[PDB]
Amino acid sequence: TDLKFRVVREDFADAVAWVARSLPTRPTIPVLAGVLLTGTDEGLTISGFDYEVSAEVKVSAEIASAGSVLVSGRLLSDITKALPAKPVEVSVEGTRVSLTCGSARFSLPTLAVEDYPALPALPEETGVIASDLFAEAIGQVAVAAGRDLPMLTGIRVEISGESVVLAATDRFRLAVRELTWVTTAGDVEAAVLVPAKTLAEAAKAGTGNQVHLALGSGASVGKDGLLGIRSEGKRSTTRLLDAEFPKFRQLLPAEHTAVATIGVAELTEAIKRVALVADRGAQIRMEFSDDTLKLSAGADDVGRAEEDLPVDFAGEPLTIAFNPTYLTDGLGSLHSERVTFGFTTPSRPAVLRPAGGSGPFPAAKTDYVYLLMPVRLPG
């Protein structure tokens, strides 16, 4: 049977665009860059799979004839993005697939499916989380993942019943986000490691007020070796990462000798000004005392810069330096009006959290934390 359907230009383009995000670029197995189109009873299914990551979306379409066909991914996405806002008519004839839309007519070759792998079955459902929370949390934590060191390239997902903990580190920063979700099956006590770039890219995409996470259930959580992600009309899988995540909880300070609260916008805009002179973006310095923060960067031979900000500060005054990018990375993941820094010494990790005597100061309980290692002041 030969696939033939009519579809709206906008729904077709957006769906193909969603899939095309997860296709490989220049794959050793060229057919893996294909997009699979399947006409069913419900309508049209659009999928891609490269043995590692799969993406499948359903879109309404008028199916004149059931069937499936594999066509080149980047070409289809480029064509569909370039068509007029008219209906699109797709029709498989022989070894070609005809795509007509208004005055424009395309004739693409079919790809062979003999060496094209089948979509994996998604694991059993584990839990449900709101879509906006999911995007935000993944987006927060992924900023701290290594880009290699396989154990640093993943996001750790710990599940303890209703609670979920996401974590990632690259040895210089550590981001941890805790959230609550709705369990699908029974109580679950488990942890997996998901490739960060892949999970972060999936989150940035659309998904639908809810996101269903499929990792299995009972004693088989993690067994299929897969994380399934489901939203309204969309299903995706990623292979889990085979590496042990470092023990990170011991790193989080129970208390601080100094704490500082400041506006995130104020601080960020100022960090960008001062870091302008940092040779290779080496370091920015933060001098805390009284009610003012002094930022500085640069050196004698390249140029210096400094800026004073009002700041709510308590405890023993200190000067501490950071990688400016690591610092703005942290600041940008807070999603709060203010940040509270928790310090001990210039050479020990600093805590940034979304936002009292002489100290010491108990660590604040927050759903999100970004632990940043300092760099050494020049000496």
Binding site: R171, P246, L251, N323, P374, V375
Partner: peptide, 10 residues
């Protein structure tokens, strides 16, 4: 540039 005090890994 010290690292975070991961043991192992620093």
């Amino acid at each position: 540039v010290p690292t975070l005090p991961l043991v192992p890994x620093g």
